Design a protein around this ligand. Structure first.
Ligand code: NAG
Ligand code: ARG
Length: 246
């Protein structure tokens, strides 16, 4: 398990949490020095538990699929909540079985559905450590519209930060003041599957991507990534989605 406490949190302790989260994900290979997530894991070992504590010390436990860093569901007191998705339904066979009741949320966990449920795109939802504290608090008591927004915050401040150092740093900058994600942040989130694939394809193509990946940089300019010498590959991305899952 990994844990993060918002009480006394600062950029350093958040950084330690994200490092723990990355290190909890199993891999047998690295591809261009980036850990390659496993094609599959059977049984309960597929799921990592993240224990998150809000500023008041109340807690939720979030189940994460270790092959893709997707959040499947979470436990709040004696109630479990899962996305309306076959993969989350499967997760519910292994995690939080001692919950007194299980609620299936009225949406799947992908960005498009969550944004529809929340009533706003995540370009408009502030993120940061205060937003994460709020999100944990929201998830403690069921409200599906509010939860969709909280889950968008949760996904970006945990999973997305684990995947990209740039995103981790963006959250560190928002340790004491929320701010909507940069356009670069959104671009990276949207491109993880694509980048993971092209980095793996580059292995037998002399470090060259079979298909260029288009991204937005910190400045707001649109740029093409074509090979593994790009800063996004050498410095930023921290986990690769296995091509068998793409
Ligand atoms: C590879 O990407 C680097 C970094 O962006 C770029 O400067 C260079 O033009 C590219 N080289 C090749 C051979 O694709
Ligand atoms: N990167 C993440 N933690 N994403 C959470 C979403 C998980 C959800 N099961 C999905 O369909 O993606």
């Amino acid at each position: 398990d990994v844990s993060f406490r918002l009480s006394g949190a600062d950029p350093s302790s958040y950084g330690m949490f994200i490092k723990d989260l990355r290190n909890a994900l199993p891999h047998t290979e690295k591809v261009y020095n980036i850990p390659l997530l496993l094609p599959s894991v059977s049984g309960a070992g597929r799921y990592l538990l993240m224990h998150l504590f809000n500023y008041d010390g109340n807690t939720i436990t979030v189940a994460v699929d270790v092959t893709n860093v997707y959040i499947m569901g979470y436990l709040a007191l004696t109630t479990s909540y899962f996305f309306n998705e076959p993969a989350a339904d499967l997760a519910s066979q292994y995690v939080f079985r001692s919950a007194r009741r299980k609620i299936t949320l009225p949406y799947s966990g992908n960005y498009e559905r969550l944004q529809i449920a929340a009533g706003k795109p995540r370009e408009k939802i502030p993120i940061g450590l205060p937003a994460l504290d709020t999100a944990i608090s929201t998830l403690l008591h069921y409200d599906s519209t509010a939860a969709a927004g909280a889950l968008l915050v949760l996904i970006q401040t945990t999973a997305e930060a684990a995947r990209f150092k740039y995103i981790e740093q963006q959250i560190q900058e928002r340790a004491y003041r929320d701010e909507v994600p940069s356009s670069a942040t959104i671009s990276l989130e949207n491109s993880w599957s694509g980048l993971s694939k092209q980095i793996q394809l580059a292995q037998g193509n002399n470090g060259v991507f079979r298909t260029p990946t288009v991204l937005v940089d910190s400045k707001g300019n649109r740029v093409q990534i074509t090979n593994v010498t790009s800063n996004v590959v050498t410095s930023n991305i921290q986990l690769l989605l296995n091509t068998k899952n793409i």
